[PDB]
Amino acid sequence: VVIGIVNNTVYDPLQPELDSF
Amino acid sequence: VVIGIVNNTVYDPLQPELDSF
Ligand SMILES: *[C@@H]1O[C@H](CO)[C@@H](O[C@@H]2O[C@H](CO)[C@@H](O)[C@H](O)[C@H]2NC(C)=O)[C@H](O)[C@H]1NC(C)=O
Ligand SMILES: *[C@@H]1O[C@H](CO)[C@@H](O[C@@H]2O[C@H](CO)[C@@H](O)[C@H](O)[C@H]2NC(C)=O)[C@H](O)[C@H]1NC(C)=O
Ligand SMILES: *[C@@H]1O[C@H](CO)[C@@H](O)[C@H](O)[C@H]1NC(C)=O
Ligand SMILES: *[C@@H]1O[C@H](CO)[C@@H](O)[C@H](O)[C@H]1NC(C)=O
């Protein structure tokens, strides 16, 4: 729906702390 | 860089939710 939206990664800070746990 | 900064612990709430799993 958003006119002009762009693709980028969004960093989830939880994911690596689960990955290291 | 901060004039007058003080040392204290900062509680991360996710760390114990991992540690208690
Ligand atoms: C942003 O990402 C989406 C998803 O990868 C891209 O959408 C695809 O575009 C191609 C054509 O270039 C289509 O054949 C695919 O079917 C599309 N995927 C989906 C899920 O619809 C989109 O093109 C990307 N935007 C830019 C500017 O690169
Ligand atoms: C806040 O903590 C830092 C350490 O994290 C203290 O810095 C040390 O200070 C001593 C002298 O008191 C130096 O010999 C060390 O080299 C310092 N450590 C580092 C890593 O630079 C700092 O003094 C503390 N602040 C207060 C007001 O106690
Ligand atoms: C800016 O203009 C281009 C065409 O010149 C258009 O394809 C694009 O969607 C527009 N971007 C935004 C953010 O409106
Ligand atoms: C207040 O003054 C003391 C010295 O009297 C100094 O060490 C400290 O950095 C100062 N704190 C601030 C917030 O300016």
SS3 label, residue B7: coil
Question: Cα(B2) to centroid of ligand 4, in Å?
Answer: 11
User: Å resolution of this model?
Assistant: 2.8
Residues B1-21 as b or e (16 or more Cβ within 10 Å = b)? eeeeeeeeeeeeeeeeeeeee
Cβ of residue A3 lying under 6 Å from some atom of ligand 3: yes
Contacting residues for B18 by C-beta, under 8 A, at least 6 apart: A17, A18, A21
For residue B5, is it left (φ>0), alpha (ψ between -120 and 50) or beta? beta
A11 at interface of B, judged by CB pairs closer than 8 A: no
CA distance B10 to B7: 9
Residues A1-21 as b or e (16 or more Cβ within 10 Å = b)? eeeeeeeeeeeeeeeeeeeee
Helices (H), chain A: 14-19
Q: Which of A10, A14, A12 is nearest to B14 (CA)?
A: A14
